[PDB]
Design an enzyme around this catalytic site. Structure first.
Site, PDB file in Angstrom:
ATOM      1  N   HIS A  37       2.273   9.010   1.885  1.00 50.70           N
ATOM      2  CA  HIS A  37       1.767   7.963   1.229  1.00 50.70           C
ATOM      3  C   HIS A  37      -0.002   7.997   1.545  1.00 50.70           C
ATOM      4  CE1 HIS A  37       0.779   5.376   4.680  1.00 50.70           C
ATOM      5  NE2 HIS A  37       1.929   5.316   5.060  1.00 50.70           N
ATOM      6  N   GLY A  95      -4.093   1.479   9.687  1.00 51.33           N
ATOM      7  CA  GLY A  95      -4.900   2.776   9.940  1.00 51.33           C
ATOM      8  C   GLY A  95      -4.095   3.616  10.908  1.00 51.33           C
ATOM      9  N   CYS A 103      -0.986   4.501  10.612  1.00 52.89           N
ATOM     10  CA  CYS A 103       0.122   5.574   9.864  1.00 52.89           C
ATOM     11  C   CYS A 103      -0.554   6.860  10.375  1.00 52.89           C
ATOM     12  CB  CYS A 103      -0.009   5.394   8.460  1.00 52.89           C
ATOM     13  SG  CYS A 103       0.162   3.646   7.974  1.00 52.89           S
TER      14      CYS A 103
HETATM   15  O1  LIG Z   1       2.562  -0.630   6.239  1.00 51.35           O
HETATM   16  C1  LIG Z   1       1.611   0.089   6.028  1.00 51.35           C
HETATM   17  N1  LIG Z   1       0.565   0.170   6.888  1.00 51.35           N
HETATM   18  C2  LIG Z   1       0.837  -0.377   8.482  1.00 51.35           C
HETATM   19  C3  LIG Z   1       1.289   0.295   9.350  1.00 51.35           C
HETATM   20  N2  LIG Z   1       1.658  -0.053  10.621  1.00 51.35           N
HETATM   21  C4  LIG Z   1       1.020  -1.179  10.982  1.00 51.35           C
HETATM   22  C5  LIG Z   1       0.369  -2.051  10.165  1.00 51.35           C
HETATM   23  C6  LIG Z   1       0.255  -3.242  10.644  1.00 51.35           C
HETATM   24  C7  LIG Z   1      -0.607  -4.236   9.483  1.00 51.35           C
HETATM   25  C8  LIG Z   1      -0.934  -3.573   8.430  1.00 51.35           C
HETATM   26  C9  LIG Z   1      -0.344  -2.631   7.957  1.00 51.35           C
HETATM   27  C10 LIG Z   1       0.207  -1.747   8.716  1.00 51.35           C
HETATM   28  C11 LIG Z   1       1.181   0.529   4.727  1.00 51.35           C
HETATM   29  C12 LIG Z   1       0.217  -0.685   3.928  1.00 51.35           C
HETATM   30  N3  LIG Z   1       1.084  -1.761   3.653  1.00 51.35           N
HETATM   31  C13 LIG Z   1       2.037  -1.520   2.936  1.00 51.35           C
HETATM   32  C14 LIG Z   1       2.906  -0.392   3.174  1.00 51.35           C
HETATM   33  C15 LIG Z   1       3.891  -0.142   2.322  1.00 51.35           C
HETATM   34  C16 LIG Z   1       4.602   1.150   2.596  1.00 51.35           C
HETATM   35  C17 LIG Z   1       3.958   2.408   3.272  1.00 51.35           C
HETATM   36 CL1  LIG Z   1       4.983   3.575   3.713  1.00 51.35          CL
HETATM   37  C18 LIG Z   1       3.048   2.064   4.165  1.00 51.35           C
HETATM   38  C19 LIG Z   1       2.321   0.815   3.881  1.00 51.35           C
END
Ligand SMILES: O=C(Nc1cncc2ccccc12)[C@@H]1CNCc2ccc(Cl)cc21
Ligand SMILES: O=C(Nc1cncc2ccccc12)[C@@H]1CNCc2ccc(Cl)cc21
Ligand SMILES: [Cl-]
EC number: 3.4.19.12
Lengths: 300, 305
Positions: free
Chosen positions: A41, A143, A145
Site C-alpha cells: 500500500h 507511519g 506501517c
Molecule cells: O491503517 C493505516 N495506518 C495505520 C497503521 N497503524 C496504526 C495507525 C494508527 C493511526 C492511523 C493510522 C495507522 C493506513 C491508513 N489508514 C487506512 C488504511 C487502510 C488500509 C491499509 Cl492496508 C492501511 C491504512
C-alpha cells in the site's frame, strides 16, 4: 525469579529498518540481503485506498519512483515485484547488517516482539501475541506501517509479521513476510471488523504454571476436570477451546511443577468463576494470555 | 492506537555486552571504549560472599584471571580497578561498537529498559521502573548479574543500572554505572530486605492520561481536588506524595486531553476509594505505575532512535 513481559533484543532487526517513499507516502521497509520488503500500500494514494488495483498501480511505477533511505544513505532500487500484499524492492547493495533469518507464518496464540518504527527509525520494542481473531493489540501510530514482528532463536531472526493497518477498534492487522494477511483482512480502506476476540487458554495455563514456578499457589485447588467439561466452562467466558495439542504442549510445565494439566484446568475454571478476590498472580489482577508455554519455559 | 509496555531499541547496548569470567563465577560486563564494567562480586566465590573485603580480594588478582569474551573473541585485560561496587577492567581494544553514552543515576519512579543477558549474550529486553523502595521488579535468573538498564535520548545511551542481586522476595537490587547501589543494599550474601513499596503516583496519572488519549474516559468525573487533599488520600493508599513538580510535568498531557492534573487526581481518588468495579483501563484491572509522563508522550507521539 520474577516474570516480565519480555521482548527479544531488537538489535538484529534495527540494522534492517529502512524508510521507503513512493510519492507522498512514507513507511518502513525491512532490508535483508539485497531486497527491501514493505507493505504494497506504499504505492497507494490516500484516496486509491478504497479499491486499489495493486497490479495496475505497480505496472505504472519505475525503480526510480521508490526512494529507499537506510540511515543517511539512499539505496538504489534496481528491481521491484509484488508477492501477495508485500512489495519487494531489489536494491543494489546487500545489507551488511543482515542477520541469519527466516520467514515464518505463526498461528493464533503465538507471541512475538514488535520493533515499532517511524521513517525507517526504530522507536520502541514491545511484546505481542497473534490474537485468536488474527489481530494484534499493538501500539502503532500513522507511519508505523512496515514495522515488523519477530522472534529470535539462537542468532536467527524469524520474521513473522509486517504491520499494514489499524482496524476501527484500535487493533492491528498485517501479514507474514510473504505478504499473506493474518485473518480475513485486506489492504483496502473498506469496512472491516475484527471478529470477537477470545482469551488464549493455553497461554493462560502456561502463565499459571509460571506463577507456580515463582512460588504462587493460592489459586490451586483439589479438583481435576475432563478436557470436555473444561471446554464447556471455558467457552462461556470467551476462552478458546483447549485441544489435546495444548495439553501435550503443557506436559513439560506439568512435569516440572507436579500439577497435571487437567488439574491446572480445574484451577482456571475456579478462577473464572470466582475472580481473584483482591489477589494478584505474578503482579496481575487479570489472567494473562500473551505468554506461550515456550515463553514460560524460556523465561522461568 | 494501543499502549504497550515498551522498551527502548536495545541494539546500541547489545553491541556492548561481554562475558566476564573470574574463577568459578561468570557474569556480564559492559564494554565501553577500552573498559569493561561489571559487578565487583565477580572476584568473590563461596567463602568470599559471606564477608567480602573487596580491596583484599581484588589486590591478589592478576589481569589474566579475568577472562573477557566479546562474542567468540577473547579480550586482553591490561588493568583493573574498583569504583564503589563496580569493577572496571581496562582492556587493550576499544569497542568499535561503542555508542554515544553517559552514565546517569536515576530517581525512584523513573523508568528504563533492561537488557537481560546470560554469558555475555542478550536474551531479552523489558521495561521497568525504579520502585520508590529502590528495588526493581525485574525478571532475572542466575548469571544475569552485570545486565544493564538504560534510556535512549536521541542518539545518546544513558546507562542507569547494573544488575547485582535478587532479594528474598524475588525483587532485584543493583547500582548505577558508577557502582553506587540504588537503595539500602550491599553486595554481600547476608539478611537484606526491601522496604515497604509505594505506588508511583505521577506515573499512574500519566497512564490515566494515556488511557484518555486511547479513548477510555469511563473513570473521568466532574470533580477536582486540592493538591493537599489529594496527598492526604494518596498517603492512605501507600501512594507516593504528588509534588508541584509532578503537576508541572503532567502539564503537556493535561493540555492535550483537556483534563487538568487536579481533575485527573479526583479520578484517581475515586478509583482508590471505590475500585474499578469490574472495569479495566488500557486492558489492566490495576492502576499501572511504570510509565512516566515522558514515556506516555514519547509513545503517543512516536519518537524514534
Ligand atoms: O491503517 C493505516 N495506518 C495505520 C497503521 N497503524 C496504526 C495507525 C494508527 C493511526 C492511523 C493510522 C495507522 C493506513 C491508513 N489508514 C487506512 C488504511 C487502510 C488500509 C491499509 Cl492496508 C492501511 C491504512
Ligand atoms: O543474587 C545473586 N544473583 C542473582 C541475580 N539476579 C537474579 C538471581 C536469581 C536467582 C539466583 C541468583 C540471582 C548472587 C547469588 N546469590 C547471592 C548473592 C549475594 C550478593 C550478590 Cl551482590 C549477588 C548474589
Ligand atoms: Cl532511516
Amino acid at each position: 525469579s520474577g516474570f516480565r513481559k519480555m521482548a527479544f533484543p531488537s538489535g538484529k532487526v534495527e540494522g534492517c529498518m529502512v524508510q521507503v517513499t513512493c510519492g507522498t507516502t512514507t513507511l518502513n521497509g525491512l532490508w535483508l540481503d539485497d531486497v527491501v520488503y514493505c507493505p504494497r500500500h506504499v504505492i497507494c494514494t490516500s484516496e486509491d485506498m478504497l479499491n486499489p488495483n495493486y497490479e495496475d498501480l505497480l505496472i505504472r511505477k519505475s525503480n526510480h519512483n521508490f526512494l529507499v533511505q537506510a540511515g543517511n544513505v539512499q539505496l538504489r532500487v534496481i528491481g521491484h515485484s509484488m508477492q501477495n500484499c508485500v512489495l519487494k524492492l531489489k536494491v543494489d547493495t546487500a545489507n551488511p547488517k543482515t542477520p541469519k533469518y527466516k520467514f515464518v507464518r505463526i498461528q493464533p496464540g503465538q507471541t512475538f516482539s514488535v520493533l515499532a518504527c517511524y521513517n525507517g527509525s526504530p522507536s520502541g520494542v514491545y511484546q505481542c501475541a497473534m490474537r485468536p481473531n488474527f489481530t494484534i493489540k499493538g501500539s502503532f501510530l500513522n507511519g508505523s506501517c512496515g514495522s515488523v514482528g519477530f522472534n529470535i532463536d539462537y542468532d536467527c531472526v524469524s520474521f513473522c509479521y509486517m504491520h499494514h493497518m489499524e482496524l476501527p477498534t484500535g487493533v492491528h492487522a498485517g501479514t507474514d513476510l510473504e505478504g499473506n494477511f493474518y485473518g480475513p483482512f485486506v489492504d483496502r480502506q473498506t469496512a472491516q471488523a475484527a471478529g470477537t476476540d477470545t482469551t488464549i487458554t493455553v497461554n493462560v495455563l502456561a502463565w499459571l504454571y509460571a506463577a507456580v514456578i515463582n512460588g504462587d499457589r493460592w489459586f490451586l485447588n483439589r479438583f481435576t476436570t475432563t478436557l470436555n467439561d473444561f471446554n464447556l466452562v471455558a467457552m462461556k467466558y470467551n476462552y478458546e477451546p483447549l485441544t489435546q495439542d495444548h495439553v501435550d504442549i503443557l506436559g513439560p510445565l506439568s512435569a516440572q511443577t507436579g500439577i497435571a494439566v487437567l488439574d491446572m484446568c480445574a484451577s482456571l475454571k475456579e478462577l473464572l468463576q470466582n475472580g481473584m478476590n483482591g489477589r494478584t498472580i505474578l503482579g496481575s489482577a487479570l489472567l494473562e494470555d500473551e505468554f506461550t508455554p515456550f515463553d514460560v519455559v524460556r523465561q522461568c
